[PDB]
Amino acid sequence: VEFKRMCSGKFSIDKEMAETQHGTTVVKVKYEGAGAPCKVPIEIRDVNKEKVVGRIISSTPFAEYTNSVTNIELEPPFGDSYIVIGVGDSALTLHWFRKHH
Amino acid sequence: EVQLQQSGPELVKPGASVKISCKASGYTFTDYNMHWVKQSHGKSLEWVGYTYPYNGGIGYNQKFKSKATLTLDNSSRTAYMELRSLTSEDSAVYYCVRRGYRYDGAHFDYWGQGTTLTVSSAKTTAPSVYPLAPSVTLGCLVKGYFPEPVTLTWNSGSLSAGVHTFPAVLQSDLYTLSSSVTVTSSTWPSQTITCNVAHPASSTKVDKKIEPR
Amino acid sequence: DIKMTQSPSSMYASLGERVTITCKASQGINSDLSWFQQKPGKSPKTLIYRANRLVDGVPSRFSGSGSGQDYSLTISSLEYEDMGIYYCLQYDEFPLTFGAGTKLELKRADAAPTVSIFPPSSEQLTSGGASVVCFLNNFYPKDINVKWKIDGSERQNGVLNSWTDQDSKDSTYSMSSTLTLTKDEYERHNSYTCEATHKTSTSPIVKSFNRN
Ligand SMILES: [Cl-]
Ligand SMILES: [Cl-]
Ligand SMILES: [Cl-]
Ligand code: NA
Ligand code: NA
Ligand code: NA
Ligand code: NA
Ligand code: NA
Ligand code: NA
Ligand code: NA
Ligand code: NA
């Protein structure tokens, strides 16, 4: 609350990743690390995990406390992309494939 | 139509491993996750875990993390659940069930027929059939057999009504059940009565007849 | 883990009646809730998902409602094929969790149990064992008291029971009671009795035989 920093610990998927009814994807994550409250590191990269694509819809997502749960809405581009949550080796890398309805 | 076909029943010793399959058809396989569910006899359903078709999206119920290994094969549209270091507590019926993660997907709407797993260090043993002699009621006791399934009929499927075959009960690595049939008094003990017991695990068909003590 | 609590555990109804059963999550699950029906020895059949979406093909007498922590399943007009056990499932958060179920059974007029007792077989006595069997068939309701007596002395140990599900014909229950015993100690007593007390009568039904 006083100092806003990026979470350094591990996240885990806490619900099936799924499509909304308005062309977006929702991901729920449990924060298992420390230093909370802290900001959830998250971005979407291309099929090569290189360039940043799509965008995050939710306002700056936070992990409020240890073992807290956070809902995140984002907008992957069409085709293959990777939702990367957290930093370092423990980072979650989730393959998403978006088709045209 | 949507269909989830699972592999047949499994019987193994403790310490062994098994791998149950679930072939899907009638829908876009990659648009659905496959969940596995455990149901011990007489108990509630229990979540084992799930698999997501892309980049080994794997979710384990923490309870089963050291027990189960879930996998997918998108090209054959087949899901697999591998259980290891098996014990008697692993004995149960296991189901696969689909969950659509797309905007137009349905959730847990189709289940597989289920797959029975029995873990035990017991031997295959044919049962011992005994007659139960005194409208009138009669019966037969089936005692001392390990493979759960036995089939009971009366006079080879002749008597259908007024029949009650009770669930078997395990006492010491062996099962025991009983069956009864109710008929008119006049017909007995003139018209013949016989309990037919088929034990598939032993490949034996043993019949015993009911005559007054 | 999110705890799912179904109420009631079991209940009775008559054909044509509205039935409503409930499922409460220990925290809000944002309508990520499905209902299933399951019959003995069969796989679950799904009725509802997303709390109120009727599964294609499922009869319209089934409907789902609720939000936050509380969810209800309602059968507008009960039909015979609706007997069985109903389960709810939350999939809002890992691990997925299920309620313990609600057994739905059919009402009917009271019926006294037909009691029959059977001495051990001569075939079984050749081996070192002896089982006495007593069937208590076709009674309702399912509340029942069963006690064995050997030469007058109530015997509890060595008794194992088994129950059938609500008979698919007359909607009654039946029960097998088996007093297992060693040959030797069986051949020390004469009178064997299976006795049943049921709401249908203050007088208990008494069946017996004499080893003579
Ligand atoms: Cl069961
Ligand atoms: Cl069952
Ligand atoms: Cl049905
Ligand atoms: Na999307
Ligand atoms: Na990240
Ligand atoms: Na980057
Ligand atoms: Na099977
Ligand atoms: Na279980
Ligand atoms: Na059960
Ligand atoms: Na309705
Ligand atoms: Na409520």
Side-chain angles (χ1 to χ4, degrees), chain A, chain B residues 1-212, chain C:
Chain A
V1 180
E2 187 175 16
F3 305 122
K4 293 172 156 59
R5 316 186 181 89
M6 300 298 170
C7 301
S8 64
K10 178 211 279 231
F11 289 87
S12 55
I13 300 298
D14 209 14
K15 177 184 187 306
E16 292 168 276
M17 295 182 47
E19 250 164 41
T20 68
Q21 299 297 318
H22 47 263
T24 62
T25 295
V26 287
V27 181
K28 184 180 291 184
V29 295
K30 179 185 181 184
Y31 185 58
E32 306 179 5
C38 49
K39 297 186 286 192
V40 182
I42 183 169
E43 57 185 25
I44 315 180
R45 305 204 197 109
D46 61 25
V47 75
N48 294 311
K49 300 184 182 71
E50 183 189 20
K51 302 192 179 201
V52 172
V53 294
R55 65 178 188 265
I56 303 132
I57 300 301
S58 299
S59 58
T60 311
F62 269 88
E64 297 180 5
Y65 54 86
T66 301
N67 296 327
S68 66
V69 179
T70 301
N71 258 314
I72 307 173
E73 183 174 5
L74 38 78
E75 193 185 71
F78 289 100
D80 295 284
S81 66
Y82 286 93
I83 302 167
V84 184
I85 304 178
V87 302
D89 298 337
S90 295
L92 289 183
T93 301
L94 311 153
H95 182 189
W96 187 260
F97 174 48
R98 177 180 182 188
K99 315 182 198 180
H100 292 267
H101 296 358
Chain B
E1 187 200 341
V2 174
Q3 287 185 44
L4 301 178
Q5 177 71 11
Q6 300 183 222
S7 49
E10 300 279 13
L11 177 64
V12 305
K13 291 192 173 188
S17 295
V18 299
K19 188 162 177 172
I20 298 177
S21 68
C22 176
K23 200 188 199 304
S25 64
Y27 65 97
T28 306
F29 190 76
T30 56
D31 286 343
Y32 281 74
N33 299 333
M34 194 71 78
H35 303 237
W36 290 93
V37 173
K38 175 186 181 181
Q39 183 173 39
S40 302
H41 186 72
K43 290 81 148 185
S44 185
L45 309 160
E46 195 172 13
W47 190 57
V48 175
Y50 88 114
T51 55
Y52 161 71
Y54 296 109
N55 266 69
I58 192 57
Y60 290 102
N61 184 334
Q62 191 184 34
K63 171 169 175 165
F64 292 95
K65 68 179 180 175
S66 59
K67 176 62 63 176
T69 300
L70 312 180
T71 57
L72 279 183
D73 187 335
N74 292 337
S75 62
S76 67
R77 314 194 307 278
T78 304
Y80 299 96
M81 173 188 66
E82 179 182 325
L83 303 175
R84 62 186 184 279
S85 303
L86 291 166
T87 64
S88 60
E89 288 194 4
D90 289 311
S91 299
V93 178
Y94 294 89
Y95 301 98
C96 56
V97 51
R98 74 170 195 163
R99 196 282 224 215
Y101 66 87
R102 302 289 185 189
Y103 80 105
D104 62 340
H107 310 160
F108 309 98
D109 63 329
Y110 280 90
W111 296 70
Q113 84 276 17
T115 298
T116 309
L117 171 64
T118 309
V119 182
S120 179
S121 55
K123 299 290 171 57
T124 296
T125 70
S128 303
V129 185
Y130 300 140
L132 299 177
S135 295
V136 60
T137 309
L138 302 169
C140 284
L141 181 76
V142 183
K143 178 180 177 63
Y145 69 94
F146 167 53
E148 171 57 43
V150 298
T151 313
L152 274 77
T153 57
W154 284 101
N155 287 350
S156 184
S158 179
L159 298 83
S160 302
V163 184
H164 298 300
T165 303
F166 302 86
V169 176
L170 187 79
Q171 74 287 346
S172 61
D173 288 25
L174 286 177
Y175 288 103
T176 306
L177 64 70
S178 57
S179 173
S180 68
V181 61
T182 294
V183 296
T184 62
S185 186
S186 60
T187 63
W188 205 76
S190 59
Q191 275 148 287
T192 61
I193 303 294
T194 312
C195 62
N196 302 72
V197 182
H199 189 44
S202 70
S203 300
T204 67
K205 171 81 175 185
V206 178
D207 304 335
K208 217 109 179 185
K209 302 185 172 179
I210 324 300
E211 291 231 25
Chain C
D1 297 8
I2 295 172
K3 181 178 179 180
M4 304 300 297
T5 302
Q6 288 183 251
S7 303
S9 294
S10 60
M11 62 174 296
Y12 292 83
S14 304
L15 304 181
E17 296 185 349
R18 174 199 53 84
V19 174
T20 298
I21 64 179
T22 60
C23 180
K24 186 163 191 148
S26 56
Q27 66 189 238
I29 57 175
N30 304 286
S31 295
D32 288 331
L33 182 295
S34 295
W35 292 94
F36 315 100
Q37 179 190 1
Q38 186 183 29
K39 300 174 175 162
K42 300 302 184 188
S43 63
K45 304 288 175 172
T46 312
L47 308 169
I48 300 291
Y49 67 93
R50 279 292 302 165
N52 66 12
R53 170 61 151 86
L54 183 66
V55 174
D56 294 334
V58 174
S60 59
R61 63 178 176 277
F62 293 95
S63 63
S65 63
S67 58
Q69 294 177 247
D70 289 285
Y71 300 86
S72 297
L73 178 73
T74 294
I75 309 172
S76 60
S77 184
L78 188 61
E79 312 235 51
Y80 179 85
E81 65 185 5
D82 298 336
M83 303 315 131
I85 301 180
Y86 292 75
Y87 294 100
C88 60
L89 155 70
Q90 74 79 17
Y91 52 99
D92 192 56
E93 211 179 87
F94 294 161
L96 304 211
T97 47
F98 294 84
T102 295
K103 188 189 297 174
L104 183 57
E105 288 166 301
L106 198 55
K107 275 179 177 166
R108 65 145 292 154
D110 299 342
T114 303
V115 183
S116 305
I117 189 176
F118 300 87
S121 62
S122 58
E123 289 90 319
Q124 176 180 15
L125 283 165
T126 58
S127 60
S131 302
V132 197
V133 178
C134 176
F135 299 118
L136 310 88
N137 301 337
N138 302 82
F139 60 92
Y140 187 98
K142 80 166 82 178
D143 283 23
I144 195 167
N145 194 287
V146 177
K147 52 190 175 190
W148 292 83
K149 289 186 177 181
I150 307 173
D151 288 331
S153 177
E154 186 178 353
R155 184 59 172 270
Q156 303 191 41
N157 180 257
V159 177
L160 294 174
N161 312 273
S162 186
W163 291 68
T164 57
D165 303 292
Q166 195 169 28
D167 200 83
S168 60
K169 171 55 186 179
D170 59 17
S171 296
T172 66
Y173 298 91
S174 299
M175 181 185 183
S176 168
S177 187
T178 298
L179 171 58
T180 190
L181 197 59
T182 300
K183 192 201 182 200
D184 287 17
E185 65 201 355
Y186 164 83
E187 303 203 332
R188 302 178 199 166
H189 303 94
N190 176 38
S191 184
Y192 285 85
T193 298
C194 170
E195 173 173 348
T197 307
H198 197 245
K199 79 164 296 188
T200 44
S201 175
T202 57
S203 297
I205 302 174
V206 180
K207 289 289 121 66
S208 299
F209 72 80
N210 303 285
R211 178 195 62 131
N212 49 19

